[PDB]
Design a protein around this ligand. Structure first.
Ligand code: BTM
Ligand code: MG
Ligand code: MG
Ligand code: MG
Length: 340
């Protein structure tokens, strides 16, 4: 029963959830990976990992992915949550040097992951293992695009480190631009391609309908995270959230800000419904009778179908995951699943 302020009747009615058939094995295999890579302590893995629903989030998204592709995506996604937690803890504890060194290591590992599989920082080693596996599915040109995108993500996290240590809340437009990077919009968009087995040509993935559908799926995911994660973030002195920027820069009340974020999220849905018609028409057009055309058509159709699945997977994840259940914590500023 979704809280009334967070409920989206259009998602519930018109975006039925899907779940990949590999999910049961995925749940246990990513938990074992978090344990074996020492990304969380064993007692915290046992108590909290399944309840965090990280594998459920990806298995509701990349439908049709080969099992090995889904496994690498799920491990990387769980890694990305643990990295968000490390970044938060380094900010809270004023560990500017530790963050700077981790930032530099991630840039280097991203370009040479095999070299870093046994690094002394288990967070770097776990990153490198997941990225090396993601780099084994498609040509080097896709790997280079993933790396270009993630270098940009790392730098967006560095900007957040400086904003939070200096007390700065970004302006609304500044925030919206930063949030496309901190939520990793273009990484999730890149990962559609190994999931459907095809690196798309620039001419296809930059088609305006593919681009706009991809963008709106990610804006929904990030802004719905902002809507649902606002309480945990206020409690933890996090400043990065569309609602916080609106309160600060536009002088809205909390209630006014939550309503404006919710309206922005609802508009993403109905803008997506419009452009989805065009992106599926484009998938139809690619099927021109040729073998290549059929391949590209099926890949675009699968990817646009997963851009739609992201809406329902992200919506339910925020009500199922222990990650956001701040009311259940003894110390609302310190989630129990982080290493403090
Ligand atoms: C910290 C996790 N994330 C990606 C999973 C940062 C890249 C933001 C996010 C959280 C939840 C749903 C959508 C995005
Ligand atoms: Mg966070
Ligand atoms: Mg973050
Ligand atoms: Mg958030």
């Amino acid at each position: 029963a979704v809280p009334p302020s967070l409920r989206l009747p259009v998602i519930e009615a018109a975006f039925p959830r899907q779940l990949h058939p590999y999910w049961p094995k995925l749940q246990e295999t990513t938990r074992t990976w978090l344990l074996e890579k020492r990304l969380m302590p064993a007692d915290k893995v046992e108590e909290y990992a399944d309840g965090l629903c990280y594998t459920d989030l990806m298995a509701g998204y990349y439908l049709g992915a080969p099992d090995e592709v889904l496994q690498a995506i799920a491990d990387y996604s769980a890694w990305s949550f643990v990295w968000d937690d490390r970044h938060d803890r380094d900010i809270v504890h004023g560990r500017a040097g530790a963050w700077r060194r981790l930032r530099g290591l991630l840039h280097t590992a991203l370009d040479s992951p095999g070299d870093h599989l046994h690094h002394e920082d288990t967070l770097v080693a776990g990153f490198a293992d997941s990225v090396r596996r993601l780099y084994a599915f498609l040509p080097a040109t896709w790997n280079a695009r993933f790396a270009r995108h993630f270098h940009t993500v790392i730098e967006a996290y560095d900007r957040e480190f400086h904003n939070r240590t200096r007390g700065i809340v970004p302006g609304v437009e500044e925030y919206l631009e930063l949030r496309r990077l901190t939520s990793a919009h273009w990484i999730w968009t890149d990962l559609l391609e190994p999931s459907s087995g095809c690196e798309l040509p620039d001419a296809v993935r930059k088609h305006p309908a593919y681009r706009r559908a991809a963008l709106l799926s990610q804006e929904f995911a990030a802004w719905y995270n902002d809507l649902c994660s606002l309480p945990k973030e206020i409690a933890g002195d996090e400043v990065h959230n569309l609602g916080i920027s609106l309160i600060t820069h536009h002088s809205l009340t909390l209630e006014e800000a939550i309503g404006e974020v919710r309206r922005r999220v609802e508009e993403c849905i109905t803008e997506f419904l419009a452009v989805e018609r065009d992106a599926l028409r484009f998938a139809d057009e690619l099927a021109d009778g040729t073998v290549r055309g059929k391949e590209l058509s099926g890949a675009v159709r699968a990817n646009v179908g997963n851009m739609r699945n992201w809406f329902s997977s992200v919506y339910w994840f925020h009500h199922e995951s222990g990650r956001y259940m701040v009311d259940s914590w003894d110390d609302r500023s310190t989630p129990p699943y982080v290493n403090n």
